Amino acid sequence: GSRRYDSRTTIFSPEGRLYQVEYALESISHAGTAIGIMASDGIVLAAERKVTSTLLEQDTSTEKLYKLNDKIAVAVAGLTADAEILINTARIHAQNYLKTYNEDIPVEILVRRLSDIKQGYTQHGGLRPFGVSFIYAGYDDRYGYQLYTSNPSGNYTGWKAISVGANTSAAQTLLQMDYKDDMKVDDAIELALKTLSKTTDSSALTYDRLEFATIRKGANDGEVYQKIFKPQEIKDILVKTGIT
Amino acid sequence: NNYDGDTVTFSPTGRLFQVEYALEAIKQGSVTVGLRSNTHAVLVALKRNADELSSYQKKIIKCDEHMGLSLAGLAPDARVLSNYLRQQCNYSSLVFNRKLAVERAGHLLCDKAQKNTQSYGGRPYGVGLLIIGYDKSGAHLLEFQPSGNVTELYGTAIGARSQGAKTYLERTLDTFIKIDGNPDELIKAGVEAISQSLRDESLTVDNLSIAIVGKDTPFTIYDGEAVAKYI
């Protein structure tokens, strides 16, 4: 029968590792780097677009940074198509919670459920896992500003600063060096851009190969604002820190 | 070789190896004999134990008042198939007030076994059956093979060393077919038949199993001290 052609995507190696999860992580390590940095007064999300062409429409484009609700965003590393499947599920899940309890969903609860979906694809169903790692940036009134990451295994962890995708080893060492707890958003913006600039596989970091976003309480009084940066705004912030 | 992974695969010479391997399980089973006259049909079965502390595996099963079988091979598979026969005999009685013809019983077993030889995931049944019965056309004896092949016979035997009894019955054909209106003599002929398949062991009181059905006799099984008469 069809047994002959079954890859057995949800089995253990003799060493107790999940083949497909390991190979999905190997895939993600070639995707453009994405960095998240959590400050005391906000969060920065920075991501490098995968080798751009000059005829790509840059302003009407979205590849790395997606909005889940008004208080939560994600940076993506891996297959974009796989990520959008999961993003739409996450968007719906947030609305289900809001409909049920009349309160915006706590960040961890959303992260756990999305991570639980990934876990399922590694234990049952015989399907390939999602080749995606997320950086979650969000705010709620319990824990305030929060950064999380999840990967194809469905395992998630919380961070002060973290990178996913390419050159995470080098990126993490640089973040570990210059990060401190009393840091402000504008300092974190600078650290994020400086780290990408040193870890990039490109010749020089320019506005057209970046996506940028902040989550501040820099609205007017006790409320949170999501700012997905426009091309010209990335061009300005790159000049303001003296990278170009 | 490369064509015995499942029942759904033919070999290059047109063989079904899984069905043949199922047939092999019958050959390892303990010998059982079947024979009939015009008035009665008799099953004789050699029972097998695990050791001297164990019981002797029962070989004969009743299906209705007028029908029953003996088994050789995987016993759980015989339980599944006998249960199916019990239901089919029963359906015929409840719906049509009709005793199931021994021939139809054979056709039904054939078709049930066949379906397990043409689909992925399943396996063939690993047991052979000898069905005896008395219906509106007199006494009958059938031989079931898990390939699906069912055959009506005057007498036969299946299991290990069944060839000895099968040869004997082939010689005795003209004698035992005319043992009409005499149960004890038809059994004696069956007990002598199964004796041609014995090696180093002889028929004892908790070793021998005999069943009979006929004109004025419901399907009944004899074990223990009730078979001492025939040793």
Binding site: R8, I11, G16, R112, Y156, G158, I162, L175, Y179 | -
Partner: protein
Amino acid sequence: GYDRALSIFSPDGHIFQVEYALEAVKRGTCAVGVKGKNCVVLGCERRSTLKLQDTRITPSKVSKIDSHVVLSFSGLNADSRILIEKARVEAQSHRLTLEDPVTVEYLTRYVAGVQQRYTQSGGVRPFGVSTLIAGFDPRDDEPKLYQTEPSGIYSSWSAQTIGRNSKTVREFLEKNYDRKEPPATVEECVKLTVRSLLEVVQTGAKNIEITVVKPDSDIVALSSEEINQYVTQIEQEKQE
């Protein structure tokens, strides 16, 4: 539906997928359970290749199943969430129908049954998780500590450890734990637990978690400084 029998017997009579799930447990961070005269203590290793962690929000290693029972584990973290969720749901379901919280034995028996089911169901792999389940039965002061594993077998332990280098810490506990006289107090029990982890861990800084469960739903997690005092005290007695 995906049907494949993934857990099957091999010629020598082993189920390799279950045995490989045990290897995932062996890779996981060390977890230890020690029960005293009036308490149970659950200790857990946390690897230190991860700096820049946020410990406020990162999932804790010991989870409350109900107000009176806790569950720690070794192995795949994602797998453990599924077992914890099911256990928490069964806890509330038991309270609803029996009008009494679960016993620790019952909660363990349920979790072990779930694990076993995933070893002979089509289309699923076994859980890469072994658990330590500790607590006190309703209106009872006798300490309870149970262990489960991927195969589905479970049993009660005076003290037990699971995870990487668990054979080293089990060795320690086997000569340092007296059945005739279990740690008489909370302090004694926490110390023996911290000592056993220090055989394997590295630094007694933000690498060790300790959770103490006492009778009648009395569960509290120790902070860094509180644990660090045990680490400091043990090292000074060692230099002798």
